[PDB]
Design a protein around this ligand. Structure first.
Ligand code: CDL
Ligand code: BCL
Ligand code: BCL
Ligand code: BCL
Ligand code: BPH
Ligand code: BPH
Ligand code: U10
Ligand code: SPO
Ligand code: LDA
Ligand code: LDA
Ligand code: LDA
Ligand code: LDA
Ligand code: LDA
Ligand code: FE
Lengths: 281, 301, 239
């Protein structure tokens, strides 16, 4: 079925591939070529996980875990039972994510809007490929990749982190966290400002953008503006994920020692290295 | 194709002193400069700022917090500016030892200074909370910003005030220092058998994650429909335009359901506040009720 | 124990929150309809919320949502298939008819007002003392279409007074008449403004405003709609 205003937008065209062939809807969902692609890669990927859950002998969602090949296999293939299913599922997952983004591009073209949403999504895809492709390949083994399981993937985060001491000391991790925290601050403020203006004190008229600008200048002496806050959210969230990928691309490649010890570059600088007192002297 | 991440052209007019409503204009400053740099991304106008009683109390109180810590950091550096800058991230104003429990009797050099700094911070944040309520009341706006801010204040209160009290010593609180508060965080996890088994930590992360997912989605969407005046969210609520429609329909056609221009802001405020809300509960229950999240997780009970 | 009670409570609260959040987001577009406009049988498990009423500033009345939905305009479209879920082909020129990516909404035929009740968007010539403060000043630049032909020249910037930003370029055509172009759909270059969305021959077809110093929400939707529709519908003449 259709939203009351929807019919006038359901025109032909916008497709990147297959002309008018897949140019149709199933209920609310637009299909397109990349809809079919997404269904195929997703269905095959779900079958292979169920198969993996057979060879493992558990139908429990909290136990099922597809592990990469052991480190001894390096960057070669591996028996399905020992990390080959992970290898095929990882291809199927990349296929579905990239298909999903190109499907968003088709939806953009039909609606005559900008491509900002699939561009933003590509950053999430980039982070995933860092952990399961770029970092493993740079390190020489699929084994350095994370397993596909609810609790076993958490186990990997913990072991990978603690391999380099307290992972807090990764300076790209520090910057990534700052963007994640600031993003949430900015999302709370944005949600609250628009709602405080649309939903004022009982009996009063809807406020105006002017009230929203006024409120924030009164509070902190600056208002970024209604276009600015939307630019800022996109930038804060994409930055968090950029620095997330960066913090892990440099971990186990250019830096494989304790992250805490990296900070001696600063402490051992010639002009204060030998001065006594403080914590480091 | 132009992307609307930066303005192509800036325009300036007379400085905007803002809406009056029931605000005491006596307490507003005059406009600061215009920043052309800022103006490529957002507004160029700095100021005016409103500074009433609460503003000055908060601002003075908050500087006394910052200065108290810095005095201690200078002392630790033996007053040597080279040592200060070298060890900047290594200095730490630590809370009173467990010996002194919840007493205000500890000496300056063994936690008393921590209690002074903390008192100043306590007054700084709560006065600032009162200010977010009042500045909205004066403009006749909803108190959404005040209620959202309370969610952040909750986690902060729990880490430094509520949990230390229930445990029965100030020694449980967070030290003031860059690297030291990180060690505290890492230590806290180990002592409670790994926060990853704390289900509230799990939700806190989901919401943190989801805040980045949602503002990425939202920001991108509004830029994608800014060619139909999409960023004018309040007038699109009062009188839906093609921007609100194409926005809704992109998401309906992608994932099967959609938002209103107003309703997306309710998704937004809730995704965000639930981070610090679930977070604070997760920490409050740690060492008060649950010694070990691994163990608790094994009984689920 | 106290932690199991807390987590079980939270999951119940979270189910209530998702229910509340979803029904709040059904205040526009609902109920669902079949392609013919009749109400759809299956509406999903979420009911319509109780109406809420916004009081609009400057005596412009109220809005109550949800309320009766109608396009309040004709839709030049026709089915291309005998079952649901296929595209609806334009029955004329989709740019003129305002369908597909050329779609506009019948918004109020009034301009948006600032908080003081003055028109939010004025030409810069009627806004004391607004000036270009940074970046290339587009006023006097020739406007090129995606066919790489000059369609006109910029003769003003229309500015949002309260938010101090450019919103449209006023463009003079061969015939001495003017049109608004959205700021977000042009490229300001050193020696020209470039418009990828439209070819030179489609500039005359841009909907005209009925007063030279104000633009209404209806006129904004018709202009922005038309220009965006160019990306799909002017692709034959793009180079
Ligand atoms: C820790 C403290 C953290 C507090 C976080 C508050 C979030 C703020 C959200 C919000 O909308 O606040 C505005 C809202 C009112 O704003 P306003 O400016 O007075 O109203 C302006 C408009 O007239 C009206 O403004 P409006 O219409 O935009 O806002 C109306 C708002 C009104 O919101 C509320 O009434 C708040 C609801 C309570 C929030 C507290 C949740 C606690 C979590 C418990 C977890 C369990 C652990 C065990 O309605 C809702 O959002 C309804 C919430 C639905 C919850 C579902 C309940 C499920 C029950 C289970 C079955 O704030 C509050 O109600 C304050 C709550 C303070 C609690 C102490
Ligand atoms: C003991 C553990 C260590 C630690 C070890 C590590 C390790 C190891 C890692 C991190 C990573 C991160 N750490 Mg750390 N980290 C620690 C403590 C912290 C603390 C804290 C307060 O203490 C914080 C806030 C963080 C925060 C962070 C982030 C900066 C980052 C994760 C975000 C990310 O990469 O998203 C990126 C987003 C994605 C990858 C998601 C992509 C989604 C894809 C594209 C789509 C999926 C679709 C789905 C399957 C479809 C579902 C079906 C539908 C629902 C129908 N860490 C401690 C000290 N941390 C990670 C990182 O930076 O990764 C690059 C990382 O590998
Ligand atoms: C980012 C850095 C680390 C990482 C570190 C952590 C830490 C720390 C935590 C998680 C947690 C989660 N992680 Mg993780 N996680 C990583 C990468 C992933 C990837 C991936 C790249 O494919 C996926 C799909 C997940 C998915 C998940 C969820 C099971 C859970 C909540 C996520 C969330 O709310 O996000 C925001 C997204 C939304 C709100 C949208 C909804 C998404 C839904 C809920 C995803 C469900 C996926 C489903 C279970 C997968 C199977 C479906 C297949 C189609 C068959 N993680 C990498 C390796 N992850 C939390 C947890 O509780 O796990 C036990 C948690 O504490
Ligand atoms: C080894 C480290 C441990 C770990 C130990 C802890 C501990 C301990 C805690 C967390 C907490 C969190 N962890 Mg953890 N965490 C781990 C690994 C992770 C990983 C990962 C593996 O990728 C992630 C993504 C996270 C993510 C998170 C967040 C979801 C959560 C903090 C939310 C927040 O916004 O607080 C940031 C927001 C605030 C602190 C609110 C502050 C508000 C106040 C009022 C601001 C005052 C400002 C002041 C006036 C100064 C002014 C400044 C200037 C004017 C600029 N953790 C591992 C297992 N984690 C916190 C939590 O909620 O626990 C459940 C917490 O206490
Ligand atoms: C870059 C900023 C943030 C961001 C942005 C972002 N995400 C997005 C988008 C954007 C802009 C979309 O448009 C798109 C969307 O449609 O959102 C509703 C999306 C999306 N981000 C999603 C999730 C998601 N995003 C995350 C992160 C982020 N996304 C960043 C924080 C995370 C985290 C933090 O973990 C998750 C879980 C989806 C809801 C959606 C993409 C849906 C999609 O691609 O569907 C196609 C695929 C399937 C239907 C499933 C296929 C199954 C596989 C073949 C097998 C399983 C493999 C998998 C690796 C198993 C691992 C499980 C274990 C780890 C538990
Ligand atoms: C949903 C919860 C998220 C959140 C929300 C949030 N924070 C908030 C608010 C809200 C809704 C405000 O209204 C308030 C504010 O004014 O924001 C502009 C604030 C605020 N959150 C701030 C910081 C902050 N928030 C953080 C966290 C978060 N904020 C969460 C991620 C963090 C982190 C990640 O640790 C920090 C550092 C301030 C910008 C402000 C509180 C200001 C305050 O209390 O001032 C007291 C101190 C001084 C005036 C003097 C400072 C000393 C010298 C440096 C000068
Ligand atoms: C102001 O503007 C805005 C809107 O509108 C006005 C919006 O709506 C939104 C959108 C946001 C919301 C509606 C808020 C809620 C969103 C979240 C909390 C984000 C998290 C999202 C999810 C958990 C949903 C994910 C679900 C998916 C991807 C559906 C997958 C299920 C299927 C069955 C799909 C099957 C696969 C294919 C290929 C499609 C069908 C094809 C064939 C059958 C062939 C935003 C951002 C916005 O800013
Ligand atoms: C350059 O030189 C100058 C002079 C400027 C000095 C330099 C200053 C410097 C270098 C400052 C640096 C400051 C830093 C690094 C601070 C970092 C702070 C961090 C990381 C804080 C982290 C967490 C804080 C928490 C959780 C605090 C919570 C506090 C409370 C909840 C308040 C609790 C109040 C208490 C215990 C007192 C209660 C008493 C009464 C009477 C009610
Ligand atoms: C995040 C706030 C500060 C933003 C400052 C960024 C300045 C970028 C300048 C853009 C260059 C101008 N240009 C060429 C696009 O017109
Ligand atoms: C985000 C921080 C921005 C703070 C900007 C504050 C501007 C204050 C203006 C100072 C001018 C004071 N006075 C009285 C001369 O108008
Ligand atoms: C605004 C609400 C958004 C809903 C998002 C829900 C995400 C579910 C996260 C599952 C976490 C499970 N666990 C193990 C931590 O309890
Ligand atoms: C556990 C979190 C994941 C939940 C994802 C739910 C997706 C909702 C799909 C909506 C489509 C329903 N339909 C076909 C009636 O429109
Ligand atoms: C992570 C939570 C997000 C998913 C919440 C579930 C909402 C499903 C909405 C389906 C409603 C579809 N319908 C018939 C109203 O158009
Ligand atoms: Fe918004």
């Amino acid at each position: 079925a259709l939203l009351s205003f929807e019919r006038k937008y359901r025109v032909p065209g916008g497709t990147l591939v297959g002309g008018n062939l897949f140019d149709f809807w199933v209920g609310p969902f637009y299909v397109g070529f990349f809809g079919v692609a997404t269904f195929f890669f997703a269905a095959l990927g779900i079958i292979l996980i169920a198969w993996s859950a057979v060879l493992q002998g558990t139908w429990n969602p909290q136990l099922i875990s597809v592990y990469p090949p052991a480190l001894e296999y390096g960057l070669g293939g591996a028996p399905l039972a020992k990390g080959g299913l992970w290898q095929i599922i990882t291809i199927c997952a990349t296929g579905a994510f990239v298909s999903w983004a190109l499907r968003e591009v088709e939806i953009c073209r039909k609606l005559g809007i900008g491509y900002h949403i699939p561009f933003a999504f590509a950053f999430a895809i980039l982070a995933y490929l860092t952990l399961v492709l770029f970092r493993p390949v740079m390190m020489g083994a699929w084994g350095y990749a994370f397993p596909y399981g609810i609790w076993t993937h958490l186990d990997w985060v913990s072991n990978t982190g603690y391999t380099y001491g307290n992972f807090h000391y990764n300076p790209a991790h520090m910057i990534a966290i700052s963007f994640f925290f600031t993003n949430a601050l900015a999302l709370a403020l944005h949600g609250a400002l628009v709602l405080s203006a649309a939903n004022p004190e009982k009996g009063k008229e809807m406020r105006t953008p002017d009230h929203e600008d006024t409120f924030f200048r009164d509070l902190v002496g600056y208002s970024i503006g209604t276009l600015g806050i939307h630019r800022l959210g996109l930038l804060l969230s994409l930055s968090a994920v950029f620095f997330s990928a960066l913090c892990m691309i440099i971990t186990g490649t250019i830096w494989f020692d304790q992250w805490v010890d990296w900070w001696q570059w600063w402490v051992k600088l010639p002009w204060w290295a030998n001065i006594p007192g403080g914590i480091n002297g | 194709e132009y992307q609307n991440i930066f303005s192509q052209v800036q325009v300036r007019g007379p400085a905007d002193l803002g809406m009056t409503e029931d605000v005491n204009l006596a307490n507003r400053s005059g406009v600061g400069p215009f920043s052309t740099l800022l103006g490529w991304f957002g507004n160029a106008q700095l100021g005016p700022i409103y500074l009433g009683s609460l503003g000055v109390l908060s601002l003075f109180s908050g500087l006394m917090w910052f200065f108290t810590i810095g005095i201690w950091f200078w002392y630790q550096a033996g007053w040597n500016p080279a040592v200060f800058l070298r060890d900047l991230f290594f200095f730490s104003l630590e809370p009173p030892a467990p010996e002194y429990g919840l007493s205000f009797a500890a000496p300056l050099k063994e936690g008393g200074l921590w209690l002074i700094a903390s008192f100043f911070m306590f007054v700084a944040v709560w006065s600032w909370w009162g200010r977010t309520y009042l500045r909205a009341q004066a403009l006749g706006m909803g108190k959404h910003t005040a209620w959202a801010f309370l969610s952040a204040i909750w986690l902060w209160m729990v880490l430094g005030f509520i949990r230390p009290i229930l445990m029965g010593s100030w020694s449980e609180a967070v030290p003031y220092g860059i690297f030291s508060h990180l060690d505290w965080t890492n230590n806290f996890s180990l002592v409670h058998g790994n926060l990853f088994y704390n289900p509230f930590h799990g939700l806190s992360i989901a919401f943190l994650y989801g805040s980045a997912l949602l503002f990425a989605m939202h920001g991108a969407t509004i830029l994608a429909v800014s060619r139909f005046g999409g960023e004018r969210e309040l007038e699109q609520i009062a009188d839906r335009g093609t921007a609100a429609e194409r926005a809704a329909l992109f998401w309906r056609w992608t994932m099967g359901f959609n938002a209103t221009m107003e309703g997306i802001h309710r998704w937004a405020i809730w995704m965000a506040v639930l981070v610090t809300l679930t977070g604070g509960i997760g920490i409050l229950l740690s060492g008060t009720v649950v010694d070990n999240w691994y163990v608790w997780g094994q009984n689920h009970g | 124990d106290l932690a199991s009670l807390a987590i079980y409570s939270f999951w119940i609260f979270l189910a209530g929150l998702i229910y509340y959040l979803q029904t709040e987001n059904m205040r526009e577009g609902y109920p669902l309809e079949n392609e013919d406009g009749t109400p759809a049988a299956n509406q999903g498990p979420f009911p319509l919320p109780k109406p809420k009423t916004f009081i609009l500033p400057h005596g412009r009345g109220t809005l109550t949502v949800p309320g009766p939905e109608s396009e309040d305009r004709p839709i030049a479209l026709a089915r291309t298939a005998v079952s649901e879920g296929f595209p609806h082909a334009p029955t004329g020129d989709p740019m003129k008819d305002g369908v597909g990516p050329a779609s506009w909404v019948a918004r109020r035929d009034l301009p948006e007002l600032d908080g003081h009740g003055h028109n939010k968007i004025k030409p810069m010539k009627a806004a004391a003392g607004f000036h270009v403060s940074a970046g290339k000043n587009p006023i006097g630049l020739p406007v090129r279409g995606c066919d790489l032909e000059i369609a006109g020249k910029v003769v003003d910037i229309w500015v949002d007074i309260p938010e101090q930003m450019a919103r449209f370029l006023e463009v003079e055509l061969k015939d001495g008449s003017t049109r608004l172009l959205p700021m977000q759909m042009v490229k300001v270059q050193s020696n020209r403004v470039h418009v990828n969305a439209l070819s030179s021959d489609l500039f005359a077809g841009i909907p005209t405003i009925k007063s030279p110093t104000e633009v209404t929400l209806l006129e904004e939707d018709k202009i922005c709609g038309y220009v965006a529709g160019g990306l799909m519908y002017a692709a034959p003449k793009r180079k």
